[PDB]
Design a protein around this nucleic acid. Structure first.
Ligand SMILES: [Mg+2]
Lengths: 108, 114, 46, 36, 97
RNA sequence: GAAUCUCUUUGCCUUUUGGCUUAGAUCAAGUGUAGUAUCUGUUCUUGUAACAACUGAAAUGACCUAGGCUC
RNA sequence: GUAUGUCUAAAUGCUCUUAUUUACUAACAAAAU
RNA sequence: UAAGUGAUCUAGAAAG
């Protein structure tokens, strides 16, 4: 089971059944991995910003996207499905915030 | 790590075509894949007697057989197979063929149907 | 479950295989008929 | 067969594991009492 | 690719094996069939490995042929197989080095 | 009377059994359903003469303390 | 839910074939108008 | 002479 540096774990070969049995990590480890991935994503965005790659505004937007899209961006919810509540809350915030923020200004 | 795994990890340099070619090159050398009598799990439809030790293996009894392709097909473009079995008691190689003209099987120097 | 063989390709009693066989026969049979008639005609001529 | 009934249970003491069981977690530290 | 063999000979695994062979020199002489005609093997290590494999095979053959149903024909057949294996082993002990 | 051995009967003996569940379920089925995996052959691989030079290699063993000559 | 167990001394490149699969797994589930 | 305002559940992963 090889770890990407983005924390998305997945298998090298197709595992024989014994191997699979041995190597089913559970709800702890996966959760941890997810958390790490999230961290990387926020940290990655800041790194990008620091590097000339992306504007401050862009960085901010990226961060916002990450925080709202945790749900899509990376499976935490899979492993612990009360993160679903958090996701929902984030979505709600986005809905509220976006409507406040894009009043006279248009969709984008 | 989980049977429904979407994407298997590949190295950062994995020219898929090239990889395939390489595999092919190392398939003639390979032990398994370059052989006949590839394994299979099957229940026995015929319900027959093992000719050596007379062990009455009944219908639907499960075995780890060997399926092999018979080169001489039925008619033209519909294959037929030899399906090896062992008797439980004595280790005599029973087998049978699947001639699809009658929608049924044929015994092949293993046992007799009854 | 019961009869395993029913979930195998090689099993001829599987319906798909049977269908395939029928198709093969049907095509081949048709061809034979086409040729058979011709043969008959030839014989008649002779 | 080995599908088998039984004769007796057990109770043998080893070195403790030091595992953080969920139920074992603290809860109701305060014991109540009677009036007298 | 049920029953493990398929998995083993799945393309990815093969590729991995090839890579290993290329870099570091991990071969599995179990995995490939031993060649028929010796003297198409200039390296010594490879030859040694082959010899080892054949020895192992011979041992395996030996282990099974003393089974209790001695009158069965499989055992008899193996006796010839055993002989063949022995011959192969002998051949592998060629005198080039 | 005492020692022992052989047979029969009674007692003692596996005059027969180490779980539970919907008797565990079923003696039926164009199955459906989910998953997991890649293949066919055909081929590439100058002579003759004269002059200058050497007459001989390899194996292991016989001597001396890996090395040195002889057979 | 893709079972399992024993067993182990320390030729080179080449290309051509595809509108497919000798494909394998059945632990899973089983009805009519 | 007076209709027609608003109430909006959800939400996937493993093993079996
Ligand atoms: Mg279970």
């Amino acid at each position: 089971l090889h770890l990407d540096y983005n924390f998305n774990l997945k298998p090298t070969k197709t595992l024989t059944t014994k191997e699979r049995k041995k190597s089913r990590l559970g709800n702890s480890f996966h959760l941890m991995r997810e958390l790490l991935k999230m961290m990387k994503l926020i940290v990655d965005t800041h790194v990008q910003f620091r590097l000339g790659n992306v504007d401050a505004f862009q960085l901010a937007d990226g961060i916002h996207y990450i925080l709202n899209h945790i749900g899509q961006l990376t499976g935490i919810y899979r492993y612990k499905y009360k993160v679903m509540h958090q996701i929902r809350a984030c979505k709600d915030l986005k809905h509220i915030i976006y409507y406040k923020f894009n009043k006279n200004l248009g969709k984008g | 790590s989980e049977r429904k795994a979407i994407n298997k990890y590949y190295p950062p340099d994995y020219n898929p075509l090239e990889a395939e070619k390489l595999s092919r090159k190392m398939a003639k050398k390979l032990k398994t894949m370059n052989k006949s009598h590839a394994s299979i799990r099957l229940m026995t439809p015929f319900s027959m007697r093992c000719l050596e030790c007379n062990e009455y293996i009944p219908k639907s009894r499960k075995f780890n057989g060997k399926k092999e392709l018979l080169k001489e097909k039925y008619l033209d473009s519909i294959k037929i197979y030899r399906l090896t079995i062992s008797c439980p008691r004595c280790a005599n190689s029973i087998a049978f063929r699947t001639d699809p003209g009658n929608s049924d099987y044929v015994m092949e120097v293993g046992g007799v149907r009854n | 479950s019961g009869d395993l063989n029913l979930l195998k390709s090689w099993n001829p009693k599987l319906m798909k295989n049977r269908k395939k066989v029928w198709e093969t026969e049907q095509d081949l049979i048709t061809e034979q008929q086409k040729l058979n008639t011709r043969l008959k005609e030839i014989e008649k001529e002779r | 067969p080995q599908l088998e009934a039984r004769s007796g249970a057990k109770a043998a003491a080893y070195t403790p594991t030091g595992i953080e069981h969920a139920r074992l977690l603290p809860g109701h530290t305060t014991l109540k009492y009677r009036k007298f | 690719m049920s029953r493990n063999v398929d998995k083993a000979n799945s393309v990815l695994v093969r590729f991995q094996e090839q890579q290993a062979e290329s870099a570091g020199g991990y071969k599995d002489y179990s995995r490939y069939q031993r060649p028929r005609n010796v003297s198409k093997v200039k390296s010594i290590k490879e030859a040694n490995e082959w010899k080892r494999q054949v020895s192992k095979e011979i041992k395996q053959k030996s282990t099974r042929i003393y089974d209790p149903s001695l009158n069965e024909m499989q055992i008899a057949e193996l006796n010839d197989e055993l002989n063949n294996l022995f011959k192969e082993w002998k051949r592998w002990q060629w005198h080039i080095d």
